[PDB]
C-alpha cells in the first residue's frame, strides 16, 4: 500500500482523497508542473495531479498486474484503460502564478479540440459541450494556491470545480454532458499525443506496487 503525496511547488498533492461530491476515494496516480517554454527561461505557471478512484486498482489488475514501469510507460493501451477505464478519475490543477479563467482555458480547451478534431468526434454537440467550459471559466480568477477540478465520470460528465485553495468544493461549477468531451481533458495529459510525459512515468512508476494488491483500500 506505499501510494505517496507529492508536492510541485509547494503545492500539496495529499495521497488519498475523498470526494465531497461523489463521496468516492481517489488515490494520487501522479503529479507533475506546466507552464511555457518561452522567453528562453522556463516559467511554471500550474501544478497537475491526477487521482484515480480506488477501485481503478481492481480493474486495472486483470490486464496490467505483474508489468513493470518500463513496459507500462512504452504501452499506450495501458494509459487508454486509465483514460477510459469504469472509474472515476480527478484532475487537480493548482496555480503557481495568478492566471484569470479565460487565460488559463485557451491553451486547455486549444489542445481538446484539437484531439477531438484528430478523432473524429467534434460536431455541434462537442462545440457546444466545449463552450459551456469556456463559459464555466469566465467568471473566475485564479491567484496562486488556488485549484480547478476535473471531475471525469466514466457516466460521460465532465463536473468542473474551483477552490481559492487545494480542498475539493462541495458543488460543482458545471456539469459537461458529453462523452467525447468527458474524457478529453485527461487525453491531453497522459494520452498518446500529451506533450509533457512527466504524468505518464508517475503513473507508470506507482501502480504495478498496486496492481499487486489486486485492489486498493483506504485506511
Partial sequence: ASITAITVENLEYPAVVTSPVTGKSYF??????????????????????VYLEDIAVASLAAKWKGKSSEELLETLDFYRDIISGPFEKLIRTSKIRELSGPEYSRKV???????????????????EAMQK???????????PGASVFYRQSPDG??????????????????????????????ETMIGEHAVSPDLKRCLAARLPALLNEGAFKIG
Avoid: Q
Avoid at 28 to 49: H, P, Q
Fill in 28 to 49: 494520487l496516480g501522479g503529479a507533475g508542473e506546466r507552464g511555457l517554454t518561452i522567453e528562453g527561461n522556463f516559467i511554471k505557471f500550474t501544478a497537475i495531479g
Fill in 109 to 127: 480547451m486549444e489542445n481538446c479540440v484539437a484531439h477531438l478534431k484528430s478523432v473524429g468526434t467534434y460536431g455541434d454537440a462537442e462545440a
Fill in 133 to 143: 467550459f469556456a463559459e464555466a471559466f469566465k467568471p473566475v480568477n485564479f491567484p
Fill in 157 to 186: 460528465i465532465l463536473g468542473l470545480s474551483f477552490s481559492p485553495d487545494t480542498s475539493i468544493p462541495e458543488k460543482e461549477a458545471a456539469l459537461i454532458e458529453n462523452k467525447a468531451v468527458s474524457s478529453a481533458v485527461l
